[PDB]
């Protein structure tokens, strides 16, 4: 993994994320939602669990993006949890949780759940 | 379980559900959100997995409520997945998914996730 994870990944909706997998489990980079403007770039930080594998398993990882930059402050944050699978068609399969800041009465409906698959192509 | 499940359950937000656990895995009843009017009662249907247990495990179950009745049509449905634990302080611990009907562009944000614990008191 590590090397394999480092790079640019794209999902099915048009988002892109560029990440660097550092020697001791760190993931750092940027997530960009769309248009192709600085206004859609947000910082992302996460971790990955590097393992000796002898049976083709995926590498578990996760990262967070707080939706605030110099052009937008969406009062929310998204975390993606999944695994990296390398090879010809390397992909990162994830499930995500997006939570928005709410008042306590609305807390019950503050989190959305979904999934995303990212590829290098 | 079965017998133990049959009855009225209340959650921490004020909702109440009355359910009948039928001999062959069926769960049928009503869910009521609040006020104490017919307008908050919705039909619920689900299933439970009845097991010989020799080690104190919970009974897995799940049910669905479509948010439509003669007074409201919220264009959504909620499913609760969890387990029944009986005894002095019997409870049903669940995680739920609420999906609203959306257009395809908004599908990505159509499902909320949460948890609920129901008790007999």
């Amino acid at each position: 993994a590590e090397a394999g994870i480092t790079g640019t990944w794209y999902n099915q909706l048009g988002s892109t994320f560029i990440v660097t997998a550092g020697a001791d489990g760190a993931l750092t980079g940027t997530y960009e939602s769309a248009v192709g403007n600085a206004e859609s770039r947000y910082v992302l930080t996460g971790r990955y669990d590097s393992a000796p594998a002898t049976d083709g398993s995926g590498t578990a990882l996760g990262w967070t993006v707080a939706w605030k930059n110099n052009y937008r402050n969406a009062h929310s944050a998204t975390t993606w949890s999944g695994q990296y699978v390398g090879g010809a068609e390397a992909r990162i399969n994830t499930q995500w949780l997006l939570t928005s800041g709410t008042t306590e009465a609305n807390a019950w409906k503050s989190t959305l759940v979904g999934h995303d698959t990212f590829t290098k192509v | 379980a079965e017998a133990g499940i049959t009855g009225t359950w209340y959650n921490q937000l004020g909702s109440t559900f009355i359910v009948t656990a039928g001999a062959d895995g069926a769960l049928t009843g009503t869910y009521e959100s609040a006020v104490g009017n017919a307008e908050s009662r919705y039909v619920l249907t689900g299933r439970y997995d009845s097991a010989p247990a020799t080690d104190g495990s919970g009974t897995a179950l799940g049910w669905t409520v479509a948010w439509k009745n003669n007074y409201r049509n919220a264009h959504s449905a909620t499913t609760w997945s969890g387990q029944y634990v009986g005894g002095a302080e019997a409870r049903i611990n669940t995680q739920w998914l609420l999906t609203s009907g959306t257009t395809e562009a908004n599908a990505w944000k159509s499902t909320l996730v949460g948890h609920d614990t129901f008790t007999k008191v």
């Binding site: 939602s33 859609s40 937008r72 929310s76 | -």
Partner: peptide, 8 residues
């Protein structure tokens, strides 16, 4: 119009 969707 959330930053996690398209576009924006």
């Amino acid at each position: 119009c959330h930053p996690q969707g398209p576009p924006c």
